[PDB]
Amino acid sequence: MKITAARVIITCPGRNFVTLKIETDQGVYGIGDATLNGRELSVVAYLQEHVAPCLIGMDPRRIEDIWQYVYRGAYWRRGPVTMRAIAAVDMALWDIKAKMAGMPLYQLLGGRSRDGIMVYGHANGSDIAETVEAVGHYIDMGYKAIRAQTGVPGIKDAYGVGRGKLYYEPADASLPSVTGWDTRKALNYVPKLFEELRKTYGFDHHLLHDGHHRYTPQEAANLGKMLEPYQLFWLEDCTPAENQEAFRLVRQHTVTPLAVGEIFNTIWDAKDLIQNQLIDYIRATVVGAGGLTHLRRIADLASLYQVRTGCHGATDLSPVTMGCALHFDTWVPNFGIQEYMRHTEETDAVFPHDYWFEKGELFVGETPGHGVDIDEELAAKYPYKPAYLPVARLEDGTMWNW
Amino acid sequence: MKITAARVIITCPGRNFVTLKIETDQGVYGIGDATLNGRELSVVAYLQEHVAPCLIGMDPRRIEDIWQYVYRGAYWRRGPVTMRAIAAVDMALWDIKAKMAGMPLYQLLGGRSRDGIMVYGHANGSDIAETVEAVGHYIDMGYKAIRAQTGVPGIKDAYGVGRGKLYYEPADASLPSVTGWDTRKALNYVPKLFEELRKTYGFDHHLLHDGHHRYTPQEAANLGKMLEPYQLFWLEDCTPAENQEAFRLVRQHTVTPLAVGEIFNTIWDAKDLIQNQLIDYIRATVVGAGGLTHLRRIADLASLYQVRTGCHGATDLSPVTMGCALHFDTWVPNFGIQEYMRHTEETDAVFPHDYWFEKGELFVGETPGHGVDIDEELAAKYPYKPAYLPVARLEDGTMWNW
Ligand SMILES: [Mg+2]
Ligand SMILES: [Mg+2]
């Protein structure tokens, strides 16, 4: 059999989503997510103008060969745009293979290792009081894990605050919004949030915090130690990690669990963080890090050091990615947790899927393939609309890490 | 002053080139290269649909701030497409600053450290005999350094062979050409090429060889040792380097100089190769690794360990890049060598530049800015044409590294 077409579909049912649909001369087709928040059209071009033309005529059953073809063949390796394109192709090909096998994707990966998939929700407030209230709401709904983010007095638009209740939509403008930041103000406030959360709700629930690249290694170590009494599930992306040695000082000084990786796109971005045992959870995703084919390798390397998966799951990852992520989560032995930000009703309608949520857990269905599809007619009713992620600047104007 | 427009210009005067032109309300403008061979339109979209809109209204004098804005602001960091876009912006802004300062770019970087810029040419042949003849031609022309690449009996289309005499144009087709490879055949043949070159021309000339990612670390060590008697200037890209530990075995076993980096896009791709002293020449370029702003940092880190610059200089790097590269080469203290593949007459006409070639050396002119400009009217006469880099497969069909 052969690939007859590899079409890119763009839609904005609440926010932008890019999808690749690989069609065959056999009839069966597969789809994959290619969404890169804030730079969506670069992937559209990468696929439409370069990768797709090469796929025509190839044998879609050869997932590994095609992955290697697009990865090595690009010559210029790795990268956000590059790997999003490769991930889209990979997801679509596994979708096709699962459909042809007549089994839901997780069965092809090795079968079910668990029943439900534990997730964490997103509690945010303008201050500690409001954030505490927010966590209680998730506890009431039956969530086992909750991420808590609070605004900080004196800081403009702290990460994860004021852009949704059951979700967080950062890309809020036609041009990047500028947010503020001050480390000292945050170091003096954040620990108090978790102190209050434990005083109010006890220690039964898993509590998470996203440091969102704001701290230096020493500052992350400082914050990590200050958070130890509160037993967090994890302190995420505490410091920029292009330099994988960045987590060394943090790991040496605190026992607060560490997580990182949502912005990683290849195993090469995390091999040292994993092998040097600097993290507890790897956050790489199916769409961000080259599909099931590559994410499997990242998860396996992590398993050697008891590092677990903690897949990123914000709204900018389409339901196609969540479907693939849940099949992955259902099988992977070293599963840790799955981030779950709820999509809009319009998004769910455009991307019919076989996965549901109940009492703090996500469940993948038994539909052959990854269980997700795209209603092209409905998708066409929501035109693309430019939306950027914010940028952060220190009080003196210094460009920082949002 | 403010940026009034950031336009992307596409042209194909012999091959594809993408250029960014930043215009200001002051009148002065600057241009930068954004060409990514084989994936050109992905960068066009990255710039046109995402980055350019953000640049409007910004102060072009703030080179560092804008670099940080586009680098950190993208959120998804690093990458071939990402850094090509950033490099284009950076080159254009330095072009503007140099013009405003009324000085050729090298003066702003710290002034002249040398007169001419030593380059190396590209000698290739279907076999050793023809390649030897080719090296002699470059020696006759006054070249001080020559890269020698030979076809290998039993191997289909060895790297750098059969696609030009004074240059090598890999992107030779509407779809990726498939070349063959066999390591044992090459290991048994390549050393003989250099043995013959030294027997024929002696040891006065610098001789280079591009391993082009074909070998494993152990095989590169083997080849490196076999090449020692011939005193090569360098053995380049001997083994894939996404894993920076890949050069360890090679460095431990041979004293043949090593070079790597044409496909790198950030200092993060080379920090360990440099700090662990695994290479002698870093090949990163102004267009591949984020402009003058970032390449300067890469060169400086290299200098700490006496590693020198050996900028990649194939035809897919436009004259805009060569102009910036020569200003960089003229100033940088740890300059090693500059690769020089000649552009077509049409390309030189579309990109008027003040640099020239003479008896083995390139020279940058004194024109304010980086000395290069683009004739938009002429550029419009050469429409974009899809062209891909080849892929390599082993004899059994295994996707390999071209
Ligand atoms: Mg995060
Ligand atoms: Mg090379």
Curated annotation (Swiss-Prot), chains A, B:
Domain of life: Bacteria
Sorted UniProt keywords: Carbohydrate metabolism, Lyase, Magnesium, Metal-binding, Plasmid
EC number(s) stated in the UniProt entry for this protein: 4.2.1.8
Effect of R283A: Abolishes catalytic activity
CDD domains recorded: RspA
Residues binding substrate: N37, H122, E262, R283, H312, D316, E339
Stated consequence of mutating Y159F: Abolishes catalytic activity
Pathway: Carbohydrate metabolism; pentose and glucuronate interconversion
Binding locations of Mg(2+): D210, E236, E262
UniProt xrefs under Pfam families: MR_MLE_C, MR_MLE_N
Reaction it catalyzes: D-mannonate = 2-dehydro-3-deoxy-D-gluconate + H2O
Enzyme kind, highest EC tier: lyase
InterPro entries: D-mannonate_dehydratase-like (IPR034589), D-mannonate_dehydratase_GalD (IPR053379), DgoD-like (IPR034593), Enolase-like_C_sf (IPR036849), Enolase-like_N (IPR029017), Enolase_C-like (IPR029065), MAND (IPR034587), Mandel_Rmase/mucon_lact_enz_CS (IPR018110)
PROSITE patterns: MR_MLE_1
Function: Catalyzes the dehydration of D-mannonate. Has no detectable activity with a panel of 70 other acid sugars (in vitro).
Quaternary structure annotation from Swiss-Prot or TrEMBL: Homotetramer.
Protein name: D-mannonate dehydratase
Encoding gene per record: manD
